Amino acid sequence: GYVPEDGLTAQQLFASADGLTYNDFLILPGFIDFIADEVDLTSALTRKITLKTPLISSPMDTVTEADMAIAMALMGGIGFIHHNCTPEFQANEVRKVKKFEQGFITDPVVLSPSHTVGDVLEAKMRHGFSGIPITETGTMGSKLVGIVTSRDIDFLAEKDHTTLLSEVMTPRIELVVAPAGVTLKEANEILQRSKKGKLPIVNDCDELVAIIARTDLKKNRDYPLASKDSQKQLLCGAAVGTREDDKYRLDLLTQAGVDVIVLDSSQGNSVYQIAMVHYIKQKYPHLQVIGGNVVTAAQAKNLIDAGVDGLRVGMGCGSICITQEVMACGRPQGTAVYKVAEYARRFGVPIIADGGIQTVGHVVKALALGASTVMMGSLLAATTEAPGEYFFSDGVRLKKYRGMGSLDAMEKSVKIAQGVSGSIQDKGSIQKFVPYLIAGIQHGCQDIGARSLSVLRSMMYSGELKFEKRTMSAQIEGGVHGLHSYEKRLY
Amino acid sequence: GYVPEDGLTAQQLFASADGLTYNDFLILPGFIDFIADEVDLTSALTRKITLKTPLISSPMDTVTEADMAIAMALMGGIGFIHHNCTPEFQANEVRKVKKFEQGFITDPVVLSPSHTVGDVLEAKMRHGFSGIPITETGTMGSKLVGIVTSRDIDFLAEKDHTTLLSEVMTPRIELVVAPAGVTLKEANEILQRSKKGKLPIVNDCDELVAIIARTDLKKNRDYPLASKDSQKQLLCGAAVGTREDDKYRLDLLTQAGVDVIVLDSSQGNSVYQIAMVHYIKQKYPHLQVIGGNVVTAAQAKNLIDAGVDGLRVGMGCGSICITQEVMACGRPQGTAVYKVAEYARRFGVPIIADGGIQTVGHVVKALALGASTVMMGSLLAATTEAPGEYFFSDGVRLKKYRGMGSLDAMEKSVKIAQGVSGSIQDKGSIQKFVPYLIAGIQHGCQDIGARSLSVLRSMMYSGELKFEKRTMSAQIEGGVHGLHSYEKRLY
Amino acid sequence: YRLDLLTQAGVDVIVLDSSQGNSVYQIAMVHYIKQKYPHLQVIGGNVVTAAQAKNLIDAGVDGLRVGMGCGSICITQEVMACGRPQGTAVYKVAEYARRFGVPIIADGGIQTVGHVVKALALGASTVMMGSLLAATTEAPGEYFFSDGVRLKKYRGMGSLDAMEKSVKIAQGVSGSIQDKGSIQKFVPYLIAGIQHGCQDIGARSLSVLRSMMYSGELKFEKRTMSAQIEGGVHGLHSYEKRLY
């Protein structure tokens, strides 16, 4: 009949202990009754935002600009766009993420019939797309007079300069349309049946109110996980500081349509951060705030009291970071995640485990310890979507990976540095790499016997999930060992 | 007035000498009267094939399958598909290169109205495209009854299994068509004006004779340099051996539509190779033959007498090669290229400089010494289009790079190994990397004062082009030296 | 426009910065300067042959910069096949340019004060240093550490990181150099080294050194690679290279 109890509960693992890292422990295997592919990875980012994937790209200038944030959101994670740039640059990166996928396009590029083929080529150069509805004024609210696309300007070579759009358009008599007040699903069925690539939406006065594009329905079927708002735009996060000038940056990011703000700090338990959370929650009540760089429940209390919608957890972990060796201050990250999540769950506040995520097994550990999402810096650095360009050193394709408190960065791009300006080897695309992390998380949960990240956390808090501590020699034994050379071909 | 003569002519450089490599000499700078961008790189591959770029991907299993050959041809070079594979696999790689861009598609995928949406999706799965004309037989020469594309099957969810194409097609009453005997230029005008993505070509009996696709006109404007045959398909090369069973491989490659054959040997001056050249030139008189890895004029004579249309130059150079330390036999590559090209030019036979090309300066040297084209192995290995998958070893993104006499290749992938089965760090895409090599060749020619590769070779043979020989310490001084670390960020 | 700003800021000499100065573009710029600013000294100059030097001396340059593809940071030879071994270039161009009274600057590949004495002996009137003065205190930018070593950046002006306004081909490689201290101590060390080189040679000045070289009084010996080993630091376990 009976079998004895084996391993520690999480409450036991952190009680009789020094601060553990992810490397200091294993999760004991459970019972498998399900397929890894059926493991649900649905994740709370904040009180009101849910992601289909637990994964976040960190707000760093060598990790997250618009290409990373688009790719993360398409993979069912999110990106937070970094703030080591002008307020206007950051708002433009946010605008790029929000424009990439659209339901109703309500603020399209529009031209007059008095504009020219060269104005459509300049529009395509400046905004990326050729499909431009034509209205009497060349402003959105006028009577629809036609539609111009790349197939209409295709191979009209050097006629750019003075060819008026009127003779180039598909004229309004010829175009398929939907009435205003059509639902997105009804407009999609009209567009799908029409076999056209645009469907203009016009009111009873025959003037343009929105347009929809077939490329968004293609993006729909291409990206089943994608993190979208109610109007089917990709979710975007952005960082801001807690200085007075961050109020201007915050206003630019909110009119760019940012969904969630992260307050970027080494040590978020401050009068400056509590003041910024209160300022945001009064001025932009719709806006989700991750106020958050904490490692203790005492810090978490003050930000949850200030009204944060999520917390970022970690201090002095993080591959690029030297905060612990400069300020003495921080915590071992597994202990921090467990302590802060066990407290913050009482208030319904989700936890982001930030920094020190070197492997997909560290992601599964962070999630098992009570994180609702995991934020990666270096693990996503030197992907193709990460900012900047590759170079070669001793014989190796490398990309920069900076740290936002490195004294390269800061400098308006005595000053105390908290980071160290690294290099990282090439990883390829986020659109292949994040599906690998997803499958790794799913197989980790499967070996543990958890059908979802929600049941994984419930097994952890009930004490059904068992842990074993590792000696240093268990960390050697659990790594690659005894070989001459090896080829770590992940995915 | 007068200025004294400075440096050696090529004839002097190779006369009073040991065998020189590309590293052993420099070209002296000339006069610049032109922009590097106006340097013409037009190159003879063989007696009848001219490329817009001097660049060739080598027939190796870690370098050239169809993705590399497509990318090389699009960049105005060519790829030779390797032969360390079944005859049927190699011919299917050649078929993929020949199908990627089309003028008239005269052998399209066709279906019957009695086929289904599921048959169109399965056709798209096999061949990569959804644009399928419908004929009442579902075979090419028959009455056109409609056209089906991805916009016709788009967002039909699970209706695949039994929905007949008849009710899915654009019917023949609605479709824009051109008459048979229309020129490609005339069909392109009809297609461009129609704003459609296909244009079927039909005879007076209203049965399908060809089709054309707008995506080929897009590929036209996207790829100005592309190496195309008369019917606008990409040029493809293939390797073959000189064994009796290579006659079967050659028949498969010729019906797959290969444009040029390279006879793959370490030492091409053999009765076996001369017999294979004679066999090809009698059985396939249209087919271009590059014979001969040769390094002497005496070897070149026998293959030019056999009737080769081009020669490969190199023996025992090549990053992967160990022929010299296994057979004692070969030549320093700069000397070999100069000697063989100075002989072969008398017969109008172009030279491929093959192997030992580590840098774009080595390309400019090979071209200056009389090569009409340059073939690269390792320089194109670990591009994205190179066969196989990336791995990590020393914290470095690597791809395998094998060699064809290596002992891992000769297992159908006493045997004597002539190569060494190694690895190369990631390079990114051919479609970015070959424009960098092109621009580097152009700036090399510009510093030399040559407006084209044709005038560069004429300056070399007349003695206008001057060379200086390098000590080992000049090779140190000419490299990166005296630094602690460096970042070789090419392009 | 840049030239007009530099001339009203009071610049004394302009250097025309190119990999390969024997061009219609450079000869046109030399003519433009010599008519618009007749007071202004022009070093039009990145040459390695007498044929290149002729066209710039005919254009009216007041000095030539000599060197191509030498230079610690440089990859021009391995990107363009084009250049010359620097000792040969300096001697060839100086033996020609002295006929016209045009001084030569030997530029790049100067690693040691002995290379300065060789460049001056071979007919250079001045020597230009990049990397030998990089990571002095007066060199632009800030020190960092990597391998437990105090380093300053040293870029190359055809680095793709110098380009991008700090297809676009690179001619240089974005390196690092170890700290050297101040120019105001380091250049007096180079001066003393040049003076002792001249003294061991028996030359009382750089003018007599060049005259001894052109008359054939100054004698040279070629070195095998093993002479370049024997003439270096060799056969020790470790050493401290404490210059000055």
Ligand SMILES: Nc1nc2c(ncn2[C@@H]2O[C@H](COP(=O)(O)OP(=O)(O)OP(=O)(O)O)[C@@H](O)[C@H]2O)c(=O)[nH]1
């Ligand atoms: N035009 C447009 N329609 C969309 C977009 N996203 C979803 N839709 C429409 O809304 C429908 C609902 O899609 P769902 O799959 O249920 O959920 P979703 O999160 O909206 O879309 P997925 O990203 O595919 O999961 C789709 O079938 C489309 O008809 C979009 O970006 N643009």
Ligand SMILES: Nc1nc2c(ncn2[C@@H]2O[C@H](COP(=O)(O)OP(=O)(O)OP(=O)(O)O)[C@@H](O)[C@H]2O)c(=O)[nH]1
């Ligand atoms: N056309 C258009 N697309 C927009 C606009 N704003 C965002 N988008 C998005 O950009 C994408 C447009 O894709 P396509 O419809 O393929 O672009 P296109 O209009 O065909 O233009 P080309 O790709 O240049 O031929 C969709 O995902 C749109 O939602 C806008 O103003 N106009």
Ligand SMILES: Nc1nc2c(ncn2[C@@H]2O[C@H](COP(=O)(O)OP(=O)(O)OP(=O)(O)O)[C@@H](O)[C@H]2O)c(=O)[nH]1
């Ligand atoms: N359908 C089709 N038409 C083509 C193709 N290649 C060229 N054409 C047509 O032939 C014309 C001539 O093109 P050119 O630019 O003169 O020379 P090319 O070598 O054929 O094409 P490029 O590859 O662009 O240089 C183009 O404008 C097209 O109308 C192709 O692959 N398919």
Ligand SMILES: Nc1nc2c(ncn2[C@@H]2O[C@H](COP(=O)(O)OP(=O)(O)OP(=O)(O)O)[C@@H](O)[C@H]2O)c(=O)[nH]1
């Ligand atoms: N459709 C079609 N294209 C072919 C065929 N053989 C080669 N091709 C080439 O494949 C490309 C087809 O491109 P598209 O016209 O964009 O493909 P599509 O038919 O629209 O199908 P989807 O891309 O799946 O929607 C062109 O470059 C064609 O020349 C064939 O049998 N049918």
Ligand SMILES: Nc1ncnc2c1ncn2[C@@H]1O[C@H](COP(=O)(O)OP(=O)(O)OP(=O)(O)O)[C@@H](O)[C@H]1O
């Ligand atoms: N709603 C519409 N009704 C009628 N015609 C339209 C409509 N939308 C676009 N068109 C016209 O249809 C043609 C194709 O445009 P469409 O948006 O469908 O594809 P496209 O994006 O331009 O094609 P492609 O992807 O091949 O580049 C053009 O002539 C365009 O003006």
Ligand SMILES: Nc1ncnc2c1ncn2[C@@H]1O[C@H](COP(=O)(O)OP(=O)(O)OP(=O)(O)O)[C@@H](O)[C@H]1O
């Ligand atoms: N020659 C033609 N005449 C009339 N209709 C056509 C013709 N060729 C294609 N069609 C129809 O036009 C619609 C669009 O097909 P088309 O080839 O032009 O674009 P597509 O490649 O399918 O579009 P997309 O690139 O957006 O996926 C489909 O309904 C198709 O059946």
Ligand SMILES: O=c1[nH]cnc2c1ncn2[C@@H]1O[C@H](COP(=O)(O)O)[C@@H](O)[C@H]1O
């Ligand atoms: O300069 C810095 N000093 C301290 N912490 C930093 C700095 N820059 C970024 N971080 C943190 O490091 C995390 C990324 O760590 P990583 O995933 O281990 O590489 C970020 O999300 C930040 O929390």
Ligand SMILES: O=c1[nH]cnc2c1ncn2[C@@H]1O[C@H](COP(=O)(O)O)[C@@H](O)[C@H]1O
């Ligand atoms: O195994 C081998 N032994 C000898 N030569 C080889 C072998 N495999 C390929 N080569 C040659 O090496 C050339 C590529 O050299 P690379 O460009 O320097 O890497 C090829 O095009 C062949 O001529």
Ligand SMILES: O=c1[nH]cnc2c1ncn2[C@@H]1O[C@H](COP(=O)(O)O)[C@@H](O)[C@H]1O
């Ligand atoms: O990017 C570059 N490519 C080529 N030559 C350069 C570049 N940048 C500087 N140089 C040359 O290198 C010289 C300095 O060489 P160094 O003293 O050996 O370090 C400079 O004075 C220039 O002539």
